Swiss-Prot record, chain A:
Outcome when changing I56P: Greatly reduces MHC class I peptide tetramer binding
UniProt-reported outcome of changing Y35F: In strain: A/Sn, BALB/c, C57BL/6, C57BL/6 X BALB/c, C57BL/6 X CBA, CB-17/SCID and NZB
Reported effect, S12G: In strain: C57BL/6, C57BL/6 X BALB/c and NZB
Glycan attachment positions: N21
Gene source species: Mus musculus (Mouse)
Effect of K93T: In strain: NZB
Effect on the protein of changing I108T: In strain: C57BL/6, C57BL/6 X BALB/c and NZB
Phylogenetic lineage: Eukaryota, Metazoa, Chordata, Craniata, Vertebrata
Region listing for Involved in dimerization, in residue ranges: 8-12
Cystine bridges: C10-C15, C28-C116, C32-C118, C97-C110
Result for mutant: I112Q: No effect on MHC class I peptide tetramer binding
Role played: Receptor on natural killer (NK) cells for class I MHC.
The name this protein goes by in its record: Killer cell lectin-like receptor 3
Sequence segments annotated as region (Implicated in MHC class I binding): 21-23, 56-57, 68-69, 85-94, 101-106
Length: 127, 126
């Protein structure tokens, strides 16, 4: 048995898991659930840039996917994000998913084996 | 009496930044009130990160001169990897230590400065 190679890291009032095995997007969603820390939602450009400065060079699935039934992009939580403005002006073509790299965010086939970022807001100071 | 305060985590630690000004020991006492002891800094990477993050000012940390046994000591009475660096700064041996963006320094403990509390996380916050 196993699960893979991951580390965790906090920043501001949020913590993340960077899962350093290449899985499909769905697998990334899956793995993140298994730790109760869901696939990453990015709130703003400050957080995006922090992640890109942080990340070891690679490609990381995040919780933004194409809704096949609705014909719209969707975060893991179905909430809006302050990236949406920029994102919708980024004209994502593929009916696929979204990853980040140190350089940017892009859209590609959800079956591509990439790394994976899980994220979760802290509700209170950790005790 | 309490006032302005925020917390922030980085890597595997979280900190409180208490922004009313108090003596060193008021910092020690206020950090305890929140169950997060006055900051102990582990190494130079941590000190640097804190200098970059902090709003310009002076902040008490859990390093004070121990009259009784004649040494600088951290809050938990343990060693820090930052110790060699500290002994090379030629502090006076008297009072307490505060951090600013440019440096850390010894001074009289009863100067009102701001305050940093720190706690190492031991598990992913649940």
């Amino acid at each position: 048995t196993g699960r893979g190679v991951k580390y965790w890291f906090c920043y501001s009032t949020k913590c993340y898991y960077f899962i350093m095995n290449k899985t499909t997007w769905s697998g990334c969603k899956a793995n993140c659930q298994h730790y109760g820390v869901p696939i990453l939602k990015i709130e703003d450009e400050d957080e995006l840039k922090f992640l890109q400065r942080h990340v070891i060079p690679g490609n990381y699935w995040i919780g933004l996917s194409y809704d096949k039934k609705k014909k719209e992009w969707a975060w893991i939580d179905n909430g809006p994000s302050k990236l949406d403005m920029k994102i919708k002006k980024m004209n994502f073509k593929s009916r696929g998913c979204v990853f980040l790299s140190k350089a940017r965010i892009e859209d590609i086939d959800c079956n591509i084996p990439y790394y994976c970022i899980c994220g979760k807001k802290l509700d209170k100071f950790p005790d």
